[PDB]
Design a protein around this nucleic acid. Structure first.
Ligand SMILES: [Zn+2]
Ligand SMILES: [Zn+2]
Ligand SMILES: [Zn+2]
Ligand SMILES: [Zn+2]
Lengths: 156, 226, 56, 61, 129, 89, 196
RNA sequence: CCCGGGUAGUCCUGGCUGUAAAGGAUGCGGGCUAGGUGUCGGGCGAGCUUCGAGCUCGCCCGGUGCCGUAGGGAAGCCGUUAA
RNA sequence: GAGUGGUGGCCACUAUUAUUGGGCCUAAAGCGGCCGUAGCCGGGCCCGUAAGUCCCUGGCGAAAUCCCACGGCUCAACCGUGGG
């Protein structure tokens, strides 16, 4: 079920079982890498880059292509971005959660009586703390990193 | 051969009314094992009299419970007798029944008739760790049976061990032919009707357990008569 | 030792006093199909070992 | 229910009306698909399957 | 959330057997489940089974022969020595050598009878009968 | 702890008044001319100890188990309760 | 489409079911019309009619029983019984007929036929208790529970019931051999139909 | 208890109190176990349409009711929204 | 039966302490509801270590007590010699 609402929505993606890219893919690995870097320069997130590639360029997914520089792993948008030195400084989902938490706090400062929005903010902050703990364990950010409502504005 | 001649007399001066009765009378059925597992209905005690004539013996007939029940009327109290009884041969075949009457004798008669109608067939053997023999002195394996609130689990026991169960279950198993067993009962055992029916269901459930061909040899499984 | 009927659909044994049934196959006429109480209630299809014809 | 879930959306090989370019596009787009040459709209996103405004040559698996 | 796929599989097998299903599907697939199914097939409690790839952990298709009375995982996975099998047999089985206690040992998973024959112990991971 | 206390070698019936047991024991006492019920209970306890030993040894594996099985059979044969060709069954 | 022409089947309206449906009848369902009504399969109906006729030919006629409480099904059952020699009980089925030996009309058939399970719930329960095979004329809304031989048909229409029973009687007679060929059947279909 | 008046309160701003038959008298996450029939949201296919974000039928997902099979329960009853 | 009764205490009875192995709609029992710290429980595959786990093998865990066979007090209780 959902993390907080405890509902059982099942909408999602159902990809076919595949191990190699489909033949009808027009572009090659290098061309799709260039397209990914071009979209990142345009200023899209990883998810939006993948969606654009799937919709406009007819690329079902970059994960189907084997990584030329590492036979032991498949390609990935984040891996391509870090190869070209454009990966996020901090995780994108955490960034989005922090951004909307800051916006919610700004709204609550003007509307102190919005207790339901306050509860939503509390849930958002719990999710942020969960992500911070996970990334601390995996070493994706400094061990002393802590989420501060005051300091989060600078990150935003 | 008193029971044999009793069966002959019944078969002579009995007029079948049902399909199974006609089968028995004409002779299409000769052994009691044929009337089970076929879906036939047993509604004539003469069938059981002919096929298991020994169930009419007093030693083979057991009256378990006698209770007085009361109905209230503007006049007063209307008393009735409920008799729970069990019959069967001490080899494979046992039956349990309930009867109601204005008199204890009528209740006993009706209960015996219904027990004969409800007679069933069981499986016996030995599946205990401390016996490992190949005789039909106990239940082949552990079984369970519940009626109402009473749950009874019967477990195999070593040869020569008495029936470690309540009096009602002990009498039922003795009539069924089982001689050695261990028991575990939960719920209100003082409810004689429910306790007896739970023991009966546990004995019946021996036929609901899937077994392999070698298990028959291993546990000395015997169906019905031995 | 007498043989004990076995259900045709599930393959389980048939207890002495269950609402089981048996009948000649309605397609060939030589095979005997047994249906146990549970299979009959659940309306589970049976397939004749001889014909291969399937039905309830 | 299904043992192996299978997508109910296909990839469409399509002809652009304005310029005639070949393209391969998704049948359930979350954006507004545009021709890479003339920048003309090809598919309209909606709650589900989009509305195709360009000729459909082929329906790939 | 999902905790023990093996327990899920065994519970599903028992549930579907009680209603007489001829075929079952086990999801997700794991090598422990595969080995347990192999042991069950060896002992004749199930029919043919196969592994299906679906881009995920995988699936198992299993045929039921209407022979299982009850199958279930054992938890916690109690460690057991060679000389400490009678108590577990009494706990989990109706009669001696009636069912099979699936045990994971240092030489793979196998029936408790096979473990006794080989003179080794392990952990009790399931039981079937 | 506590030191050793010499325990009784016979057991008392779980219920002092049961019709079946009372009749059976009365028949046995009248037939064999025993002075008191504790003699009969002592003999019953001897029997029960023998059966318990047999049951424990049946489901036992080991060299000591085999030695105990052989010793039990030999002791029973010497007492004369079993034929020379008897087995643990 | 061998026993009778598909045109005759459609005219009798044996392929018209009911607004409801059932997973048990999913296989027999042909399609659903745009008004929501489900249509059965004439080919499956024909095959099942042949199978039922062959199966019933093996039983001694006086041991076959037919039951129908529906007014539009009473007459076809009576005609089928009086033709094949099988016993027929149109209208109410007095409880205890099969289970109570003290009933005046006590009888223990070897095979039972029900025009409709839901209507003949009492007869089906008695048959289940007695332990004999059951053949049921099942519609789309019916349940195949406790049914040993199902005939997919419109068990409510007068014409459909009359045609089904006529075909069944002809099939039983042909299989039993009382008639050399199907063409030897002289009784008209119209008699099976109920008067209006 | 019925009738005529009536203060606190019921209302707004800032705080405290943390109590209810706050009861689905049923804690929460996961897998499995016949069906039928209404209604809400979304999606898909088909037929109408006054072309309406309109109407009718079927299917998938998620909610919300009723009846009900195996099974459960002392029973009342629960039964894929399990007890 | 040379014992047999009365009173207090412990165990079984008691699945009325429930790991084996109890219950929480209406009988005692689900926090009024949520988020979260420690703890407990944790998706699939590949490789490495042997901490846990299993097997084998040395040094131990006194004697008496406990079980078995034999021998000595008449058998026994009791002791002695071997095995556990
Ligand atoms: Zn034995
Ligand atoms: Zn069956
Ligand atoms: Zn056949
Ligand atoms: Zn273009």
């Amino acid at each position: 079920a959902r993390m907080h609402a405890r509902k059982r929505g099942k909408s999602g993606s159902k990809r076919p079982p595949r191990t190699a890219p489909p033949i009808w893919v027009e572009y090659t690995v290098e061309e799709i890498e260039n397209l990914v870097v071009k979209l990142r320069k345009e200023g899209y997130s990883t998810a939006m880059i993948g969606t654009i590639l799937r919709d406009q360029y007819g690329i079902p997914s970059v994960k189907l292509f084997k990584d030329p520089d590492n036979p032991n792993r498949n390609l990935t948008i984040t891996r391509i971005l870090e190869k070209h030195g454009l990966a996020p400084e901090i995780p994108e989902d955490l960034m989005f959660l922090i951004r909307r938490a800051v916006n919610l706090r700004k709204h609550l400062e003007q509307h102190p009586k919005d207790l339901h929005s306050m509860r939503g903010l509390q849930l958002i902050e719990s999710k942020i703390r969960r992500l911070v703990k996970y990334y601390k364990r995996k070493g994706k950010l400094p061990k002393n990193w802590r989420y501060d409502p005051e300091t989060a504005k600078l990150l935003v | 051969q008193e029971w044999k001649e009793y069966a002959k007399r019944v078969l002579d001066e009995w007029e079948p009314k049902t399909k199974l009765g006609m089968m028995v009378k004409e002779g299409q059925i000769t052994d009691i094992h044929e009337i089970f597992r076929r879906g036939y209905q047993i509604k004539e005690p003469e069938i059981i009299d002919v096929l298991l004539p020994e169930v009419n013996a007093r030693e083979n007939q057991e009256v378990l419970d006698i209770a007085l029940t009361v109905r209230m009327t503007d006049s007063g109290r209307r008393v009735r007798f409920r008799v729970l009884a069990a019959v069967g041969n001490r080899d494979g075949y046992v039956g349990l029944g309930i009867g109601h009457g204005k008199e204890v004798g009528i209740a006993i008669r009706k209960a015996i008739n219904y027990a004969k109608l409800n007679i069933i067939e069981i499986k016996r053997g030995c599946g205990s760790w401390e016996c490992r023999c190949r005789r039909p002195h106990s239940v082949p394996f552990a079984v369970e049976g519940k009626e109402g609130s009473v749950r009874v689990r019967l477990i195999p026991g070593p040869r020569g061990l008495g029936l470690v169960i309540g009096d009602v279950g002990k009498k039922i198993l003795r009539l069924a032919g089982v001689q050695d067993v261990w028991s575990q009962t939960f719920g209100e055992t003082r409810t004689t009707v429910n306790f007896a029916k739970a023991v009966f269901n546990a004995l019946y459930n021996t036929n609901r357990v899937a077994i392999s061909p070698e298990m028959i040899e291993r546990y000395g499984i015997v169906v019905g008569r031995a | 030792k007498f043989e004990i009927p076995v259900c045709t659909s599930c393959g389980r044994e048939i207890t002495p006093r269950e609402h089981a049934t048996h009948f000649i196959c309605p397609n060939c006429g030589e095979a005997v199909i047994w249906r146990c109480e549970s299979c009959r209630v659940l309306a589970k299809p049976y397939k004749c070992p001889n014909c291969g014809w399937e039905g309830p | 229910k299904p043992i192996i879930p299978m997508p109910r959306s296909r990839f469409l090989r399509v002809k652009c009306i304005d310029c005639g370019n070949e393209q391969i596009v998704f049948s359930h787009p979350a954006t507004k698909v545009r021709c890479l040459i003339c920048g003309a709209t090809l598919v309209e996103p909606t709650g589900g399957k989009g509305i195709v405004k360009a000729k459909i040559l082929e329906v790939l698996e | 959330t999902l905790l023990d796929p093996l327990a899920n599989a065994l519970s599903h097998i028992t549930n579907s057997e009680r209603v007489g299903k001829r075929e079952v599907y086990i999801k997700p697939a794991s090598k422990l489940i595969g080995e347990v199914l192999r042991v069950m097939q060896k002992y004749g409690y199930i029919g043919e089974f196969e592994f299906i790839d679906d881009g995920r952990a995988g699936v198992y298709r299993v045929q039921l022969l209407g022979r299982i009375n009850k199958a279930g995982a054992i938890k916690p996975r109690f460690p057991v020595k060679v000389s400490e099998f009678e108590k577990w047999e009494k706990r989990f089985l109706p009669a001696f050598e009636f069912g099979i206690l699936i045990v994971s040992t240092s030489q793979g998973v196998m029936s408790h009878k096979e473990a006794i024959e080989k003179g080794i112990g392990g952990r009790l991971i399931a039981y079937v009968y | 702890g506590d030191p050793k206390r010499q325990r009784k070698k016979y057991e008392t019936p779980p219920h002092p008044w049961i019709k079946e047991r009372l009749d059976r024991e009365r028949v046995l006492m009248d037939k064999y001319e025993l002075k008191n019920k504790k003699e009969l209970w002592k003999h019953e306890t001897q029997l029960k100890n023998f059966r318990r030993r047999a049951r424990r040894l049946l489901a036992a594996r080991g060299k000591q188990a085999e030695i105990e099985r052989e010793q039990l059979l030999a002791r029973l044969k010497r007492l004369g309760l079993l034929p020379e060709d008897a087995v643990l069954d | 489409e061998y026993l009778v022409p598909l045109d005759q089947y459609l005219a009798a309206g044996v392929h018209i079911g009911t607004q409801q449906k059932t997973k048990d009848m999913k296989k027999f369902i042909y399609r659903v019309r745009q008004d929501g009504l489900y249509v059965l399969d004439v080919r499956k109906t024909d095959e099942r009619l042949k199978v039922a006729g062959k199966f019933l030919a093996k039983f001694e006629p006086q041991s076959i029983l037919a039951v129908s409480v529906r007014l539009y099904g009473q007459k076809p059952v009576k005609k089928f019984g009086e033709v094949t020699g099988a016993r027929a009980i149109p209208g109410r089925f007095l409880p205890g007929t099969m289970t109570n030996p003290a009933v005046k009309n006590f009888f223990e058939p070897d095979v039972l036929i029900v025009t409709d399970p839901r209507a003949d719930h009492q007869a089906m329960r008695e048959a289940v208790e007695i332990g004999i095979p059951i053949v049921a004329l099942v519609d789309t809304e019916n349940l195949l529970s406790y049914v040993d031989l199902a005939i997919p048909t419109n068990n409510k229409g007068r014409k459909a019931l009359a045609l089904i029973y006529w075909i069944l009687a002809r099939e039983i007679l042909y299989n039993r051999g009382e008639i050399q060929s199907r063409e030897d059947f002289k009784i008209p279909v119209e008699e099976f139909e109920m008067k209006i």
